[model samples]
Target chain A: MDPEQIKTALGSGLLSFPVTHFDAEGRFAADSYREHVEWLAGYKAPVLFAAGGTGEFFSLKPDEIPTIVAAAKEVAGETAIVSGCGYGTEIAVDIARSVEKVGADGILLLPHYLIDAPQEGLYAHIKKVCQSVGIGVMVYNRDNSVLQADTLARLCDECPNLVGFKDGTGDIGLVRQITAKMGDRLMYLGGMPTAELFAEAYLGAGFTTYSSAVFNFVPGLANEFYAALRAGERATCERILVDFFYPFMAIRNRAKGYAVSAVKAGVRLQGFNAGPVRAPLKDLTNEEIGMLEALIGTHKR
Target chain B: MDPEQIKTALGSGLLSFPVTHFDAEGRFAADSYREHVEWLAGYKAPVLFAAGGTGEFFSLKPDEIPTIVAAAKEVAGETAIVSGCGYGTEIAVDIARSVEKVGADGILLLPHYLIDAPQEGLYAHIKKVCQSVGIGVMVYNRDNSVLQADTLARLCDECPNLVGFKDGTGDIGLVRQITAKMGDRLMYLGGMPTAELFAEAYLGAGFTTYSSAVFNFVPGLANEFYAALRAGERATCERILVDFFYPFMAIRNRAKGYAVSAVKAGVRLQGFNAGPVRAPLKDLTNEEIGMLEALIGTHKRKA
Candidate 1:
């Protein structure tokens, strides 16, 4: 898809970032991952952002990204695929080019490693990556890779392929500035961990779409909640928020990286073999799992 | 030198982290880097910490570390060399072994890239890297890799070669806890940017030494100021702090990564060929460099 087509697809409906599956021996479980994607594909999320943060992009080797993107593409059918690209400038560009070869329709540029760059440096970093491939690029705004509204606005004007902006940093002032200034030139996404908590606020701030990590486990409920949110059914949205998301966040908030871990746990609760998260991120405890199980039980339709 | 010997050397005095020089095309300038190190070596910092944060460790490729370490070792004379190692577990271990092979006396393990680990996972990451080579290891405490004092105490107990702790995150509660609990098991050093600014406060917290980026350019003033700090010469220390260090920080605070870029600018002001910092980190502007030049001029003793 071209940049305009990718932007249209991304903004049209809910987005899902599938968690990459691993086996008991810590290798990529392609079969399990394919099954998981097939299940998510059944819901027909407009875009399946593969090998993303929810997928542990930081932990995956460079070679693993293409495999995950390819598997996601096979199951995606008509759904567009956006892969995550990060690390140093050279390496991120390399991954962008590689994923483009494997038929990814778009790319979400994650943060550079370790060092914080100035606005111009970050601009240079993002501009170089966008120019490296033919696919649409969505810049992930979080942590040390934040761009000022002016910098982001200029990027939209200069780079024709820079089609989307996904914000994980909850700086609403800057978000307002970007939306007020840039308008509809870029598709804005609410990308915080468990982004649904802020979906209403983000909608107020001019974001029309978001990536749902929880959709990996409970797509039916996810679609139900998103439909109410998009329809401005405040009573229906609040019902799901209070009943499911609020209590789910209680367990996710217990650890640092559990935003990803808890979702993988929820996937396991639904009878998938989604193994333990990699190091630097611990698995939910059995007690925590039981808590998650009971919480998941209460939310079932 | 052995691990114990490297430990003793690092704690002896102010350590210098020499900035890696780059040519106009942005390649590592080996000859210029060696010249810069040889000059810093003249002042006899007990250990020259090469390829450190001040040296742009995050920007360097893996193959560049050994070349920098080898060049530093050639002119280091009696001084020991400690190189910085970081990234994932496998890559960090490989770099640790490679640096040790090229004759580094110790390794300052930088934080793991891009993820916040659980304390147990951090402990495992540090343990695996420490066990990889025979050289001494010092964990750099900052960002996503912070360890609680109790975790550090356990690390010191378990890893025999865990000889030092350098703190960049200025958490006094944690610093006090580590110093009070670990006692003499680990040597404490102030690892903040412009560490001299915090020298008095850190000294009170039990850190005897620090890594000085300014020492790359202004060794005489660095030595003079460090001596005043160590001797409790409050007036002299305050004089330098107010006249030089405080003004220096104003320029350094102008940008995000200027902490490292400003130091490289100071080195160029001293007539070295320390080139521009790589992308993701920019060089100081001509106007900013002018401010640094003025600051350096006022502090230099007319010889």
Candidate 2:
């Protein structure tokens, strides 16, 4: 898809990053991974982010990204598959081109590797990555990679391929400011962990859509909640929050990387061989799994 | 030298990271880099960090590091050379082993790529990196990788090669706590930019050394300040600070990355083809170069 075409499709509905399946040794396994994407494509996700944060894009070597994105491209059917690209400027551009060649619809540029770069550095770093590819690129605004309102504006003006802004950092004032100034020139995706928790506020902040990680497992439940959210049904949204996400958030709160772990855990409970999270991210305990199993009872596939 | 020997040496004196020279294509241009390091090694620096933060360690590919470390190894005769190693757990371990094979005396593990990990995860991540080689491993405490004092102590207990703790994070309370608890089990290096500005306080808090970027260009001045600092000459330290660092800080203050650009520029001023800093780091404008020239006039290479 062209940058413009993908930008329009991205805002048409919800999105979720598919958790990449890994072996016991933490290697990326494609067989089960594509099957999981196929299952996820069976649902309502308008966009699927391959090798995203929840997808452990941080742990995968630069060369491993294209295979993950290629698998998603094979399985996504009509679902727009965006690749997560990050690291130093050179590596990010390389990943951008690598995934774009394998048929990624767009790219979500995650934070640069490690130490914080200057705003000018961020501008230079991102501009190079955006220019390297023909597909749409979304700059993830958070951590050492947050773009100032003006810096983002300049990127918007210069890089026509840069079409979306995803906010993982929950700085709403900054989020609201970027949305108001950028207007409809770019699409915005609420990217905070499980972003559904912040969906309404993000919607108020002019984000028309959110990335629903729960959609990876409970597509029916996910579509219901996203529909209620869009239709302005507060009580139904609150009820889902209390019954499902609040408990799910409880499981996610136990560890630092559990936001990714618990959601991948949900995929497992749905009978997908989602396998283990990589190091620097621990898996949910069997006890926690029981709680998750109980929580996921009725929402099973 | 063993981890114990290198640990003692790292604490014995001041240190600095050499900026890697890059061509217009931003490739790691090593010939001038080693010449620059060969010069910095002629000074009083007890240790050198090749491909460090000032060295733009974040940008260098994992494979590029050992070559940088090997160059420093060739140039640094008596100076202990520690290679900068980082990026995700698997890659960090690969780098630790890679640099160790190329004769790195130790490894300064920068933060793991970009994402922050939990303390338990930090334990697992750092432990794997430390265990990868027999060489000394120093965890830089900052940004996405700040280790709690307890975490530092645990690593000290678990990994004997975990011989040093470096702090760029200026949480003095945490810095002081780590020193108080760990005692001499680990060497502590102050790592703030122009860390000499924070050297005295780090000294009071039990840091015996600090990383000096200006030492890349102003090695004699750096050695002079480190000597005065170690000798308890506060007024002398203040005199040098007011004359050199304060002005240096001014030029660095103009841009977010001038800390690196100005230093790389100064090395270029010294007649080495220290070349230019790579992308995302802007070079010093001619105006700032003039400011740096007058500043470095007193300290040019007599070699």
Candidate 3:
């Protein structure tokens, strides 16, 4: 898609619903993914993004990626599913080609996992992957990972396939700088985990489209919040965050890797049988499980 | 070497010197490498680690690693030259094979460039490299990379070929934890860049040896500080650091990648004619060069 086409998609206010999957032995269950996609299709999330950082893309085996993208695309149809492609150039290109083969609409190019390379190294790394795939690419900058304003501006200018830039680093300073500089060429997607908490901050900064991880389990609430955000109901949106979302993360952040682990466990609690997370990530404790149940039970409409 | 043998090598009070190599055109200067090895030999730096992180190991094209290692080994004969090997299993094995061929004393394994994998994943990464080469392996645990205490302990228990663990992370708490748990099996080498400053802290934590980056340019000063530290002259050791090393770093830290960039620039200012650093690392500015020159001028003793 061209910059104008993607900008129009953002203008219409697209919400990215993070997709979760796992296997039968309760390890990243991919079998139950089609059903989850079918359910999300009803919510009408503007796009379904698979295997993102929050989706535990790092742990997923290289070969399993195509299977996951195929299953998501099968359920997503024309909704513009954007698959996550990260790691080094080799693994990233492999995933991008697989996503293209599996027929996804676009790719979310995340930062090189842990090694903080120089900005030049990062630029080379991103350009290598973006130019490799021949598909629309959106760069996700988070952690301490930053792209030079000049480098980013030039990239958007050079790569016609490069359509968007997402600020996951959470520094409003960087967001404001990128927005002030290249908001003309780049579709700035808010990297806030839940869209409602800082939707206005992003929208005020001229980004109407943002990603909502909450849409995974509670599409109703996510839709309501995203709608309020689009409708310019800042007070209502802020109320939803303070009353519900902030408290939710407080519980989720208690354990390491629980950000994704407990969310998947929460889906299982919804009678979805989503299965447990893989190794390097363990299941929630009994006490935390009780808290998750209580939190979901109290919040679920 | 076995665990005990590895411990004995470290216990003998070894000094690890990082090598700098580049030509006038600033490519990997394999020829000038002999001069670097000769310098380390002159200072009697106990261990000559070629192509480690400070040696621009990552930026070097895969084929040139062996040539650099061979140069270090030939110049620093019988001085226990340890070559650095990391990245993925294949590249690591390749580098290790090259080190073994060049007759390097051992291989220092830095973790994967990115990807902070699970303990099991790290174990698989390290175990593969270690088993591939029969040489000694000292696993590096840097803060910016690699695994933690429980993971290191587990690796020690399983991998007999694992010789030592270097603490580049600099979190003394984690150091104390690893020492308390598995110091018996792993020879822990302190690797903080500002290692001279925290010599007493790590020494008190039961670490006897560390890799001093300051040793690369100022071996005389490094040797003096090490002697003071060993002799328990804490005040004199710290005086040298506060007066000289820390102030130099204050100016050096003004730019990104200065940890290696500025160090190489300092080497050039010392009249070695070592070339500029590689791409992804820019050269020091005129102001920095002037400051570096002033630092050397001020440090020089009277004729």
Candidate 4:
């Protein structure tokens, strides 16, 4: 995939649904997952992504990935189904290839969680994974995987398969730097759960694509904000985000690892049995769930 | 020791010498270390120490701590010695007791690395170490061990053994907050390798004592700046630091993990024969060494 082609594919205003549930046995609860994807498809979400950070991709074992990918594609059907490929280069490449084999649309490449490497090493690692699959790769930048401004420009210039960059570090300085350098070549998306707060800033800075976890429960809210932002309905967009999204994000921010856990819990609260978050991530507290229920009530209508 | 006693002790213009240099066999090169400390004593550094961040205290095996502490005390002789005590509560308290047995002055308590805990956990952790040894404790703050603004109040009111707080994080906001809150109770020191840059600001903000790695290589420069900073010669203090200390820090910043390795490498460059750093910390490259040698040419005259 050429850089221009990849940008066009991402900019089509497709809803990127990040999957966030699994059974106690650590396998995709296919029935609930399929229902979840089908309902998302009904809203015309252009992309159905499986197993990114919100998807608990880090904790997923090697053997379990194929099952999750297969289940995601089975429901995604004709939609552009993207899957997560994370950890070190070798494992990430393996996951990317597995998604390709399962006929998914693209792969979100997460950084190596352990070991801080220099820019040259990080570039080489991602380039190797991109070349292995020959598909569009969106680099997920979070934690210690920050790209210097120059390195990002060079990455956009060199790697044809590298399509976009995701912002999770919440450092607006680097975000602005990357946008100024490679905004033309790369499709930029906000990766943090509180991305809705910065979605206007990102859009104002000329980035159109943003990922929405709320799309899981209220695809209407996601569509309303996306349409408002893109159609230059700035007032309506800010109103909805401030009144709805920020309050929701306040609940999300209370717990340390609740970014992933609370999102899954929210989906479950909406009459869907999405199961519990895996270990190392405790469930939302009763107070958190009560607050979430109250917030969801305001938006449920 | 009483809080007032620790405050008065620290206020007497003490130069906290952070120790470096251990041979490949995981033993303190005692003769070289003794000579280095003895030489530092000649400058009347007032404090000679080992096993802080500069000493690679985190990586040292638990059993080997006593040897390092004893060696440091042997070298310091009459000079007050502060040793680094990091790791969790159990190990930190054990190390504190071991250092106390060696006739060392006090223990500098580094927040347990790799674990993020609340301020209450930190207070409990350090309080245990202080109570066990009955030695004075200075809290080293950085990484996962940051304390809140009211930390000084809490420490002074609660943890009676807590003597001081060191701002290693380099956030001036934190420095100001800690000073405002604990101004009367705690002795505050700028605890970082680039302490030279913040030395004047910290003093003006009410800090008197700070550790100096430059003193290891350039005592004359360290003493002159220390005297100038203490005697209200702010202009001279900033002048020497901008020319000498800032340039050295810039080189240190260029390489990763050189905060410890590069300093040890500098000591070796000055003919101390401090061996290469241990695992998880790489030595300076040949290029980095060349840069260090150039830095030495400019700074060595003050030695």
Candidate 5:
């Protein structure tokens, strides 16, 4: 797909990053993953970001990304597939090329390996990765890879395949500058962990869409809340936020990485075979899982 | 060497992390690395942490670490060599095993990738890696892998090979509690960048040693300042801090990752082939290199 088409598709509605399924043995479950994607495809989110942070991008090996992207593309049909790409500049570029070969519509570039970088170095990293593939490139601006508005504007001018900007950093002033400066040249996305908590605030800064981790389990509620947000039904959105998201965050905030772990637990609660999170990300305690069950039961009604 | 021996060696004097050399094409320069280590060994730092933060451990591939460790062990002779190990629990365990197989004496385990883990999760990660090898382990406390004093005390009780705690986090309260509680069970090292800036402060908290990046260029000044600090010669220590370190840090603070990059530039200034730092870390501009030259020139006379 062209960069313009990818931008329009991404901006059309809510974006969802489907969690990658692992078997009981902690290996990738391709069959379970396809089934989950097929189920989610029915909801018609315009873009499904595969193998992303919501999918444990950091834990995945290099060879595993293409396989997951291929599985996501098979069932996604018309839903644009965006896969996560990261590591060093060379590795990120190689991964971007592999993602394109597997029919992903675009790539969400994650941060560099370890050291913090200067703006010029970050620009060089992003530009090189963007030039390596024909697919649309959306830089995830958080942790060690943040770009100032001017640096981003320069990237947009230099790299034509750079089609999107997703701000995970909550710097409102920087986001406002990017939106005000670039206007419609790129699609803007809200990418915080529980992005719905700040959806209205980000919308005010010109972000038209967000990636919902909860959509992995509760698509109906995710779509409903997003629609209310888009329609400017402040009362309806606040009702859902208070009744569901705010309470869910209480459980999510109980641990360091539960932002991703809780979403996987919610998927397991709904009777899909979403296995335990990989190492470095601990599983929610039994009491925590019980809390999620109660929250999902209350929200589903 | 035994874990007790490793602990005693690390705490004996100044600790230095030699920068990993890269060729002009940005590949690892093993021959140049050995030459650099041979030069630094003559100054006799008690422990030389190869493939460490100063050496760009984050940028190195797993296959590259053993080679670097072997190179350091080759010329280290009597100086104990502690290599950097990290990634997931599995990768960290494998690296620790490789470090042992290559004849290095100890390992400095860096943080796990990406996630901010809970204390239990971090404890599990560290315990598993420590158990995988027989060599001594020193945890670098920084980024996503910070352990509270209680969590660290538990690891000391459980993991016998765990020998040291290096503070890169700059949390004095946590360090104070660990020192007071654990006492001599573990050796403590001050690990902030250009640790001389806070050497006296950390000394008050019971830390006796630190990693010096500038020692790669100016070992005479590094040893002189450390001796004065250890002797409680506050006047002389402050004189060096105000004149050299404070000015150098002004240049170091100009960029985000220059804490390591500027040291590499300093090595290059000293006529060694300590090539540019790897990606995610850029080299200093010509103007910045000139500024470093002037600083080093002014310090050499005082030494």
Candidate 6:
């Protein structure tokens, strides 16, 4: 429940969202999911985002979130768990408190549902969610719920538990603006699908870390990419980006939901039972899966 | 419960969504709302969309929707009521069926929740919602949930109750493509903010009708524009668009959520107790209200 510690953990370490494992009936397979979490925990991601976007949090019913958070909490030793949360304020507040009760370290609030609200509404909505939890909270600036620099600054002033800002909108100017405006007060993160593709630009924009979707499957290679970037080993980062990420981006570029679907495919190839993605997100075709297998080529599990 | 009759009504008659009137505490003001619906029903509009986009359906809770639908049905003499429905399949399905039980004649399915899905997923999502109810279902193509022509064609083949398509995305070419492909199978409606500014282009694109937001306050002026458009009086349509809708657009363009907020303000100006809009949407300032009052100069309602 210590917000500062969680904020520090988030600021320093590499992060990744683990796709929620599902059984044949489309229900969450906790044993398999925890097993997968246990495996990822061995690789040293500082924070594991349970039920985050790549994990299909948008498709999940409200009650299912805590169980996912609880599962991650149980298996994740020494690693903090940030649960994905969004929708309207009432549902989000309930989710924030519920996940907190199960020992979630923080909340990554995604865009609220359907409508595009004004900045005033976003402030009220986020502050309400932040007040509901004792844990640190991070707002994902993407889709319709993006916060302006002034609004974000106002949020930081009021919500002490507000720890990090994740940029998923791919608007570099806005990302650079937010980073410069809110310097050390908040940790900045890159939330694009392929970390390597957008990593250097965001890192240069003052992002300390980013959530690696590839890290869900190829933790070792993802670490190689992150470590090289941190160490300023430009050639190593370039070599690995060309070798793995470029080819993987091709597969990811195939469909609308392949960003998550491809990651789940890679997770399955790693021999986890992370089953098919839930509806609204189609799984990869067998041919596409074969291409990913070839691309996962040199990466280690 | 006849889908064809609702389809016929939606095709020929004018349509408008009443701004859901909320009391001081932001609770749905049923009596005032029904009165607003009763007044608008006398204006010769065919089908009224209860809990639709202009009605702030996105802000309304699931249980609150059927009550909104029931109120509209009680007050809307012979005019059909189509309730707004959306979210994930579970919530949308529940809303569709609940409103149907309360005698909502049809469902205007809005976008599902946040994430953008594949066409396959949208087909699955829309098909499931359509199958959930026996009433007619119209898809609002906008935001993250737009369906391409082929997927929609496939849907129309199967879901007989899928009788209407409303374009809010303002992609006229896509609307033309849909109209050309699904002609007579579905009724097309323009879903832009102001009816007069976009009505001619949409009518040219084969839109049979549209929901007029101003009809909530200035029904007479909205009808004047609609009548001129239908009667091919281009000069009258242009004159009214320049006079009223353009000024209204300036205020609407001032804020992000003002499309709904400005309409609610106009209703209040019309002497209805249509209180402030809900959160996530801020209402127009007193100055903006004064501007709207001046523009409604020759119209019947004097705030």
Candidate 3 local lDDT, B1-303, one digit each (tens):
343454567666646656457886767665676776676677776566788877887788767877888877667766677788888888888988887887766788887766667778887888788888777888998743567667877777777777777877655435654665565677778776656655554653457778877677777787888888789785566567556766676776798777787777767766565687888987899898888778767543232
Candidate 5 per-residue lDDT over residues B80-102, each given as its tens digit:
99999999998898889988998
- Considering only chain B, report the TM-score of each candidate against the true chain B: 0.98, 0.96, 0.92, 0.91, 0.97, 0.98
Ten residues in a row with the worst lDDT in model 2 chain B? Answer: B171-180
Q: Compared with the real two-chain complex, what DockQ does model 4 have? A: 0.02
- State the lDDT of candidate 6 residue by residue for B83-154, as single tens digits: 999999999999999999999999999999999899999999999999998999999999998998889999
**What lDDT tens digits, residue by residue, belong to model 2 across residues B1-303?**
688878878977888789898876788888888788777777757888889999999878889998888877877888888889888988888888988888888999899877978999999999999888998888899899999878888888999999988898766545755675677788888888888777765664567688999988888899999999889786677677767877787788899888889989998888888777877888999999999999887677753
> lDDT for model 4, on a 0 to 1 scale?
0.71
Instruction: Please report the interface RMSD of model 6 to 1 decimal.
Output: 17.9
lDDT of 4 by residue, B1-303 (tens): 343455556666655554556678656676777767666677777656677777777777876677777877776656667778888887887888887887656778887858889778877776677788766778878889888766556666766767778877755434544665565577787776756655654553446678777777677788898899778775576567546765676688886777778777777777776677776888888988888878778656334
For residues A189-257, write the lDDT of model 5, one tens digit per residue.
989888887676576456868999999999999999999988978667767776788779789989999
Q: What is the lDDT of residue B174 in candidate 5?
A: 56
Any residue pairs clashing in model 5, and if so which? none
TM-score of chain A of 2: 0.98
Model 6 root mean square deviation, Cα atoms: 17.2
Q: Candidate 6's residue-wise lDDT over A33-129, tens digit each?
A: 9999999998999899999999999989999999999998988999989999999999999999999999999999999999999999999999999
Query: Each candidate's interface RMSD, rounded to one decimal?
Result: 18.1, 18.4, 18.6, 14.2, 18.1, 17.9
DockQ for each candidate? 0.01, 0.01, 0.01, 0.02, 0.01, 0.01
Q: Which stretches of candidate 1 lie over 4 Å from their true place?
A: A1-301, B298-303
DockQ of 2: 0.01
Residues forming the 10-long window of minimal summed lDDT in candidate 4 chain A:
A198-207
List RMSD in Å for every model shown. 17.0, 17.7, 16.9, 12.3, 17.0, 17.2
Better of 1 and 3 by TM-score: 1
